Each structure stands twice: as C-alpha cells, then as structure tokens.
C-alpha cells in the first residue's frame, strides 16, 4: 500500500542502527502514523502476498479471552508456539486483558463488552479504550504486548479506531497488525449498526531488521495493486460469536509472497 | 508554533461537529501526530502568552505521587480544584499510577523508577513505558486521564518520548500538555546523562471547542516567534528531587495572551 511503502522507505532513509533484546540489528525510527480509510478497501498489503488464515484465528482467539494456545492448535495455527510453555500457556497476554483485566479488589473487567456498549449508548465518548498494558501482569506474560492500547471514535455514522503499537517489525509484523485491527473495526461496526471509518496506526519503535533488507528492496520495487474487499458472510448475534468461515477477502491480486527470517 | 497552528487549521478545515459529555459543541478530528525536536528550542507556544507556573508545579506534584491537592494549594495552584472533593482528594489519578500503580496481589509499582533504570541499564528497550490507564481504578478517579500512556526511546545519545493523548482541547490544553512532557524529557535526560531528542505528540479525539473559535481565528493570524530556551539551574540527585525554582525559560517573546472560557 502507498502508506506502507512510504514507511518502509522512511525507515531506510532516516532509520538509525538499533539492536533488539537478542542483539539482532535493525534500522529504527521513533514515532510514525498512518491512516487507512476502510471505505477505500480492506488494507491488506498487495506488494507481497499476505495470508490472513492465522490472523483471523488469532483475533477470534483474542476475543475469546483464553490465553492457552489449545484453540490455536485445534486449527494448526502455530504463531504463538515459540512463547508457550509445556502446557500451552502464555500467561495473561492480550485476550486475558481484553476480556478479564484483573483488578486489585479481585474483579475481572471485560473491556470488549465495555467498549461495545459505550459505542451503542455513548458514541460521543472520548474514553472508548481497550488496554493490554496491565503493568502488574507484565512479568507473568510470555512477552509484553506490542499492540498495547487502542481507542474507538464515532462521527457521521462511521466507526474509527487508533492503535498505539510500541514496537513494530515493519516487514514481518506490520502487514498483519493492520489487517487484524481493520477486521476488528469491521466486526465492531457491524455489531453497532455503524459504517466503517478510519483505522489510524501509530508506532513507537518502528524498525526494519537488517536481515529483511533484501526483501525490503524487492518490495519497494513493486507498485501497489487495488485494495481488496472484506466480505462478512453472516451477521452474528454478538462480537463474541464470529467464526473463521464468516470472513472472505475478494479482489486480492497481490505480487508474489516474500519470505523473511528471524534470528534466535 | 508551526505544527501547532497547522493542527488548529486542520481541525477548522476538516473537523466534524461533535459534542462533549456536558453537551458542549466542538469541531473534532481523530488521530494526529506532531514532532518537536527539543534541540531546536523549548516548545512553548509563542502565538499567545502561555504561563508555565501551574504546569511546573503540576509536574512535580505528579512525580511526587500524592493525589491530594494539598501541595498544589500550598503553592496556590488551583487547576485541579474543580475535580477535588471536600478533603482535597482526586482519587487515584496520574501521580498515583505513575508512582504506585496497584496490582491484584497488593503491590504498588513505581513506573517512574522503573523507566529511569531501564534508560540507564537497557536503553535499547522497546518497552520503556508509563501508563496512567489503570482500568480497575478508572471509576475511582475524578476523571480518566487525558494524557494516558507514554513511551521513551534512546538513540545516538538522545532521549525521545511519545505521548498518547486520548482527548485534547487544542486551544486551552494542548500548549500545556506539550510543555509538561517536554519538561519531563529534559529532567529525565539530565538524570540519565543523555541529550534531548524529540517529543512526539499523538492525539485521539482532538478538538476545538465552538466557544474558542474567535480565539483560534485570532491566534492563526499571528506568526510564530523563535522558540525559547529551558534552563535547568541545578542538577538534583534524582528525578524526585526537582524544585520549582530549578526551572527558567529564557528568550520567550510571545504575542499577547488570549483568554478562553469553559461551559459548565
């Protein structure tokens, strides 16, 4: 997509050499923002083929609130295997905070239900927020949330969402981060009888790994194709009742897939 | 400042009519970002005179962690009086979360000490974060935090900070929000033997109140003046030992002050 390739070029041009926790090198910038008008099309990167199978299962899994990887394994989704313990546990990552944020007084707060009802009853609200950044729970998490905090907004019948992503792997992660939250906005808008607005992406440490440079150069040589279209095949009774098969992408004509590694 | 006036003009041009919780009208946009290179000068709005007295006391008060307004009243700082109860209490707002975030297991987490030591020991970290958005504590707060979440970053000997502000009163609040966090970056950089980098400001619901329109039109007719310079007159032994008198602004030649109201 235009904004995505512009980000990649910016990191190339302006990024500074910066290492990650393993010692693996990157080029990094701090602070960036992009906006995707969801009525223009579904913002799935076209300059390489991006598969959404794991991303859809992951989002349904987040929304279900159980952080054991059993559901992912039931569907042969393996993207959290690296972080899970022998029993398949991850600690109180994403879904536990979205659905059952623990409080000092022993309650567990369902932020997703909170937001859905704010959107339906008080759409002007300036505090329609979900946070995964539960400071007390960070140490028990397999890793701290990268997509940490998000806010919804309603105007002129349209639902928008802004994500704050503290750390972003531009090449491997970001295409998927965009698609995941764009899907969530479509699901929430359907459930609230709203049209889709903008997905606004905001980054903190936004980086290209040094061993993604060949891939980045190739991708920047390609012209974006028309955005595809998301089809939701059925309207479920709530935000918690979506199924994998409810989602189809039409009109997706990407350039070929581009593989990239990780260090250990 | 250029970026500030550009934001104001954007809200004028592109903002949509949107009411707040009291029913007071605004023009609103969702999602914006600005960057202030702190080596260029201290980013204090010059197109109207902005007083920093209350803002400096407020920041020292945040850093001290006690949310009773007694310290503010000791200095005749009245900007939190509206929200305080008969005993001067605000509930677990800002400073309580910065210095003593309560956890389910009964601990209280000092996020400011955490960050200072991350900056000194693990400056490459992508999770140097302070959050005020303690979901369990929102209901006891006098109001939910507007400046909700911030992240630090180090590269090339320079400390940067990004703020996520969920709700922003562009005319009355934003000049002060910018100055408060810019001061904090200077204080933290001094304590970590770092130079100052960028303050990156990110907004959610970013709005101009309808009864600030006369003022906005006047302000947009003025040309920004050179940025002033922050002087820290003494290096304290830690981030918790700063005093009001340690701070001076030099070279501040603003256009006259512009008064603006609020509804009740």
From Swiss-Prot, chains A, B:
Residue sites binding dUMP per the record: 21, 126-127, 166-169, 177, 207-209
Pfam families associated with the record: Thymidylat_synt
Keywords: Cytoplasm, Formylation, Methyltransferase, Nucleotide biosynthesis, Repressor, RNA-binding, Transferase, Translation regulation
The UniProt record lists the keyword Transmembrane helix: no
GO biological process, one term: dTTP biosynthetic process
Gene3D superfamilies membership: Thymidylate synthase/dCMP hydroxymethylase domain (3.30.572.10)
CC terms in the record's Gene Ontology section: cytosol
CDD domains: TS_Pyrimidine_HMase
Positions annotated as active site in the UniProt record: 146
Function: Catalyzes the reductive methylation of 2'-deoxyuridine-5'-monophosphate (dUMP) to 2'-deoxythymidine-5'-monophosphate (dTMP) while utilizing 5,10-methylenetetrahydrofolate (mTHF) as the methyl donor and reductant in the reaction, yielding dihydrofolate (DHF) as a by-product. This enzymatic reaction provides an intracellular de novo source of dTMP, an essential precursor for DNA biosynthesis. This protein also binds to its mRNA thus repressing its own translation.
Family listed: Belongs to the thymidylate synthase family. Bacterial-type ThyA subfamily.
Protein name as annotated: Thymidylate synthase
Organism: Escherichia coli (strain K12)
